[PDB]
Design a binder for this molecule. Structure first.
Ligand SMILES: [K+]
Ligand SMILES: [K+]
Lengths: 177, 177
């Protein structure tokens, strides 16, 4: 198991395209990912009450099953994460459903990944939710991440609102407004 | 989903090595597989009561997650089977355990696979259980399989006892004798 530590920002200003223009010359483009995620629940453990997640992700055709444990921080999005690649999305979904998991909600996004000195900056355009940025740390501290996010938003004059809610939780908040 | 239909024979006579000698010249060797299987239970659904199975198999280093539904026949071993290859056995096991599945029993065998006209004949040497043969049908009927198994055992003068119990169930019967 590994510990994912990331900070998610709802972008208010400017546009992500404008933000890419601003970072393009000092941040190294990695790739663009079209990610379609299916989330699952289990009738025994409410993954809403225990703060867990189960996801079957299709990212540019690669299929990834991920477990996410409860949040460990209130200042960043910090969770245990265990992932495996699987050979077939339909069959993995079928297995989960045969085992009694139920399909909950689906998240879809386009994500543009950049790299700047052990930090991954992901520009996310979320279907129905809007434009966000995530920053994840490789071999980093909560304090080192909070300081980089702060230098990042200010160097590129971004107006943002930080959150530790997941995209799944955010989507549900959005559906009923 | 696909329907697995196979017949398992406890070999009484002769030795599997003697049986391979007898089939070697008319059956085409496919491969040998060293298979280590972990089975799982779920505290909600007793996979013993519902007749289901969940397996994480390591076969010659390839990792396969398989769901098996209830038996559909009393004359052959017939079950729904859904399988995916996964990238990492330890992480898949960790995910299953984080989700609440519990490791039940482990089956280990050496399996020698041969092919003779749409039939797969698997010579199985099962740790602690002994020598068995499975015959699985590709695009076949219960009747076509029952007839081939019968021609197989007689052409090669095998003394056998057919069973539709799984190797998991058989192992448990063996442990308490
Ligand atoms: K994420
Ligand atoms: K089998």
């Amino acid at each position: 198991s590994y510990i994912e530590r990331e900070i998610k920002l709802r972008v208010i200003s400017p546009s992500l395209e404008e933000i890419e223009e601003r970072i393009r010359n000092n941040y190294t483009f990695i790739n663009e990912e079209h990610q379609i995620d299916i989330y699952y629940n289990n009738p025994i453990r409410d993954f809403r009450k225990s703060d867990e997640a189960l996801r079957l992700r299709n990212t540019n055709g690669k299929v990834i099953l991920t477990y996410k444990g409860p949040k460990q921080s209130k200042e960043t999005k910090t969770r245990e994460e265990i992932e495996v690649e699987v050979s077939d999305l339909h069959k993995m979904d079928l297995i989960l459903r045969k085992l009694g998991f139920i399909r909950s909600f689906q998240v879809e996004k386009i994500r543009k990944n950049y790299k700047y000195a052990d930090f991954i900056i992901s520009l996310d355009s979320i279907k129905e939710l809007g434009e966000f940025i995530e920053i994840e740390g490789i071999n980093k501290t909560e304090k080192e991440l909070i300081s980089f996010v702060d230098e990042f938003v200010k160097k590129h004059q971004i107006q943002y609102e930080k959150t530790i809610k997941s995209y799944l939780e955010l989507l549900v908040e959005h559906a009923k407004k």
